[PDB]
């Protein structure tokens, strides 16, 4: 994995020694070269994972999240370069350095052989994201979110730390490869119940869980575009990756500890999708859509069937691409009308036809139009949860109505109807913006041809 | 103060700490603490204002009461053992009195009630000396008597120090009082792992001394004693706000910073000994000091501030203050976690 | 990489990590027994050097 970490670190002398008009071009070029390099991780096997060293490994779960992570950096550099034009050059290089450092943390978070190195890199990803959100977020009003981050630290990552140190003392190792063969059944006891909550609640907030999703339509709103792209595309999926690693140790107690949280997600995707029908803020609507889609990944991990893991990792990759494109479309209107109000600028297909085509395609991938991998992930999760319980199809299908309903409403409000009269700064689409939409959508459409590379280790 | 006399007095402070570190006889331990107190009293009264006289009087009374309790502990040791070796004690009453006396010298709770005041009244360099160098000698004596230290007393003092250092700094706008409640909390973190593994106690002591030295050196480099004057630093020197950012994030215990290194190891040495609840609630309380650090850097270090016109005069002059070891101490207080197995050199 | 290379590299990784995990559990047990009994080279808290004793004839005989 050291053929990826070292070029990502060499992006730091590349971004600090570059000429002042060249720092976007150079970082975009070399991060696209790293993303082309990232396809060497597709050397996967039907029995063995790709095990590089004592520190790094890659099965077919971590590999597509790595490719999506290394692909997300050039797109963030394209998306965030317009609204940093009047920024200081040194502050602009600090922004690019925090993006590069976040990629550096993520690409060795997903490959972490041992679980406390996963914990260190997992909680290391929060700091450059925090600095990007609070130094370039264009407004900061976080009176209620401070107490929620305190709740995240109390109920989340610290019990995970104590639990992983406990497994280190009990099993003697936290290597996931060793824990594949030295796993003991975790029986019914109160010690094992608090053990399960400690191993799971950090990743429950990171997904997020319904009821615990209070941070996500704030942190998505108060962020720049690169921060919202990396939150929607990668930083939610650390929770799902960590659940799919840590549920190896949590058998068979998961088979009766999943029942509350499954309810919290199965009803929760009914609520948040419905919440998207009453959103004034477009970026908040995409945030609650992200909650409504990660609820299915929570259910699919907690029911731990093969079809559910295949659908959950396909849904993670697909929703990463789709929701990142949705935030980029929301920014491509916000950079013109200077307000996130979804009822402000209407009828935009009269003014921007190709951009409305991109809105249509991102909406159709948002509502899981087949054969897109949004639908493949959605569908396999629905099949596995039907095998879990035959009634849940109702709570699936009703969600699959409301998921359609706000997806086209977001299309109908922003793009259709009568244009707003008093807005006359609606410029034509820059080639940068259309390139950003295409570099989201065309990989998402090409993955419908060959979905087997995004269906996880047990395809 | 005459610089020769200042050198002699600082060498006497160092000499008292050395006499406590090297001596085998309890009377010489007591002598080293007496020498250290007697020598440090003029360092606190360097500027000669009534706040320093109040701070020095309170420090004198606390360290003198602690020294008398230390000598009473030594004397009961002489009753029940007939000898004077600085080793384990031979009476639980001498153990309790010496643990109490060393807790008074460190400033641990419930004897914490001088550490925010005295550090407030004295300059930043003497507060640096108080919060770093004056921790070395009582931690050495606690390092040598740990076969006799009562576990319930040392854990009660430790968690009481951690809770009071956590909930005392939430209210604070003065930087010296934030450092003083941070001192009390870190001494709780050092003494709770003392009977389990004293090498991690030494690791916490050295990482704490590095981070505290970094913070007071940045404070002297910016001449800021309050939160609001610290907010006026970005318009003068922008890198200093970055350094107080990363060092305050390190002192609360963020990964992947170096100040996460000790306490994680401390939790790693408390679950080996089958204590789960105690390092759990201990780090729950450390989340509160990390949380007011994140308010004290989010609300009042990152997002840039209203300045004053006279600052535009101060743009025309560079810092001629001797920022001794400041880049080295800033690198070591942040970027040392990949070298976490260096701790074995303290075994 | 060949499947042979990944396979045998995985076996070497698993050997190293299994040896380290067994050694960590043995380190825990060794520290437990040496703290309990005090008969090993660890937890050797000092006592008084007996070379400090004056074995000369003293002023009075009965000692």
């Amino acid at each position: 994995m050291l053929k990826y970490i070292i070029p990502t670190m060499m992006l730091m002398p590349l971004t600090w020694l570059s000429k002042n008009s060249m720092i976007w071009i150079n970082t975009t070029l070399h991060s696209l070269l790293i993303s082309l390099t990232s396809l060497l991780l597709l050397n996967q096997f039907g029995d063995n994972s790709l095990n590089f060293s004592l520190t790094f490994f890659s099965d077919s779960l971590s590999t597509p999240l790595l490719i999506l992570t290394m692909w997300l950096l050039p797109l963030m550099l394209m998306a965030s370069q317009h609204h940093l034009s009047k920024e200081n050059l040194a502050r602009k290089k600090l922004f690019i350095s925090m993006l590069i450092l976040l990629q550096l943390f993520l690409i060795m978070t997903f490959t972490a052989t041992e679980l406390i190195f996963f914990y260190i890199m997992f909680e290391a990803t929060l700091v450059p994201t925090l600095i990007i959100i609070t130094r370039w977020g264009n407004q900061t009003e976080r009176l209620n979110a401070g107490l929620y981050f305190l709740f995240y630290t109390l109920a989340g990552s610290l019990p995970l730390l104590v639990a992983l140190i406990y497994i280190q003392n009990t099993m003697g190792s936290l290597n996931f490869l060793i824990l594949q063969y030295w796993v003991q059944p975790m029986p019914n006891s109160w010690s094992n119940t608090f053990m399960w909550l400690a191993c799971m609640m950090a990743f429950m907030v990171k997904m997020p869980l319904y009821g615990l999703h209070l941070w996500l339509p704030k942190a998505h709103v108060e962020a720049p575009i690169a921060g919202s792209m990396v939150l929607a595309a990668i930083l939610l999926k650390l929770g799902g990756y960590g659940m799919m690693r840590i549920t190896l140790l949590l058998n068979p107690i998961t088979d009766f500890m999943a029942y509350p949280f499954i309810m919290l997600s199965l009803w929760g995707m009914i609520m948040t999708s419905s919440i998207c029908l009453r959103q004034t803020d477009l970026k908040s609507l995409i945030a609650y859509s992200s909650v409504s889609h990660m609820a299915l990944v929570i259910v699919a991990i907690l029911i731990q069937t093969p079809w559910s893991y295949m659908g959950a990792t396909a849904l993670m990759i697909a929703h990463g691409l789709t929701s990142s494109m949705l935030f980029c479309l929301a920014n491509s209107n916000y950079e013109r009308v200077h307000s996130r109000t979804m009822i402000l600028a209407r009828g935009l297909q009269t003014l921007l036809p190709l951009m409305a085509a991109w809105w249509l395609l991102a909406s159709l991938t948002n509502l899981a139009l087949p054969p897109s991998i949004n639908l493949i992930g959605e569908l396999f999760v629905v099949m596995s949860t039907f095998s879990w319980s035959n009634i849940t199809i109702i709570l699936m299908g009703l969600n699959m109505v409301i998921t359609a309903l706000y997806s086209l409403y977001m299309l109908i409000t922003t793009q259709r109807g009568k244009h707003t009269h008093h807005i006359n700064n609606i410029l034509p689409s820059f080639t940068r913006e259309n390139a950003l939409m295409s570099l989201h959508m065309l990989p998402l459409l090409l993955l419908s041809l060959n979905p087997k590379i995004i269906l996880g280790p047990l395809y | 103060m005459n610089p020769i006399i200042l050198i002699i007095i600082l060498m006497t402070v160092m000499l008292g700490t050395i006499i406590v570190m090297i001596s085998t006889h309890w009377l010489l331990i007591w002598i080293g603490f007496e020498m250290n107190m007697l020598a440090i009293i003029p360092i606190m009264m360097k500027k000669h204002n009534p706040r320093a006289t109040e701070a020095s009087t309170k420090y004198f009374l606390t360290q003198s009461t602690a020294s008398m309790l230390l000598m009473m502990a030594i004397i009961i040791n002489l009753m029940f053992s007939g000898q004077w070796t600085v080793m384990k004690l031979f009476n639980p009453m001498a153990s309790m009195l010496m643990t109490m006396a060393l807790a008074m010298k460190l400033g641990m709770a419930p004897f914490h009630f001088w550490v925010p005041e005295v550090t407030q009244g004295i300059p930043l360099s003497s507060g640096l000396i108080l919060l770093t160098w004056q921790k070395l000698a009582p931690m050495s004596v606690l390092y040598q008597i740990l076969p006799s230290i009562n576990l319930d007393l040392i854990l009660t003092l430790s968690i009481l120090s951690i809770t009071i250092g956590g909930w005392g700094g939430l209210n604070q706008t003065q930087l010296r009082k934030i450092m003083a409640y941070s001192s009390i909390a870190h001494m709780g973190w050092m003494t709770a792992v003392l009977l389990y593994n004293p090498t991690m106690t030494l690791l916490n002591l050295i990482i704490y001394i590095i981070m505290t030295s970094t913070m007071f050196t940045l404070f002297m480099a910016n001449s800021t004693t309050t939160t609001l004057s610290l907010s006026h630093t970005w318009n003068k020197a922008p890198i200093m706000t970055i350094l107080v950012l990363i060092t305050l994030l390190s002192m609360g215990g963020l990964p992947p910073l170096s100040g996460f290194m000790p306490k994680w190891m401390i939790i790693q040495e408390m679950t080996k000994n089958d204590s789960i609840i105690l390092p759990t609630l201990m780090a729950i309380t450390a989340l509160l000091n990390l949380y007011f650090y994140m308010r004290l850097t989010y609300s009042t270090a990152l997002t840039m501030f209203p300045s004053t016109n006279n600052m535009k005069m101060k743009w025309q002059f560079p810092t001629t203050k001797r920022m001794t070891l400041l880049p080295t101490m800033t690198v070591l207080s942040t970027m040392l976690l990949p070298l976490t197995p260096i701790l074995s050199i303290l075994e | 990489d060949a499947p042979e290379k990944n396979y045998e590299r995985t076996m070497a990784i698993l050997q190293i990590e299994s040896e380290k995990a067994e050694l960590r559990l043995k380190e825990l047990e060794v520290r437990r027994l040496m703290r309990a009994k005090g008969d090993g080279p660890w937890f050797q808290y000092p006592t008084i050097d007996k070379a400090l004793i004056d074995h000369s004839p003293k002023a009075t005989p009965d000692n």
């Binding site: 010690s191 | 389990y196 000994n273 105690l278 | 520290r31």
Partner: peptide
């Protein structure tokens, strides 16, 4: 009503499963 009850449940399960808060040093 919440934290007192959760704490009393934790003390009950510390009685049951044998949770040590002032645990004796063993290693």
């Amino acid at each position: 009503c919440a934290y007192m009850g959760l704490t009393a449940a934790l003390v009950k399960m510390g009685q049951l499963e044998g949770w040590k808060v002032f645990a004796e040093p063993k290693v």
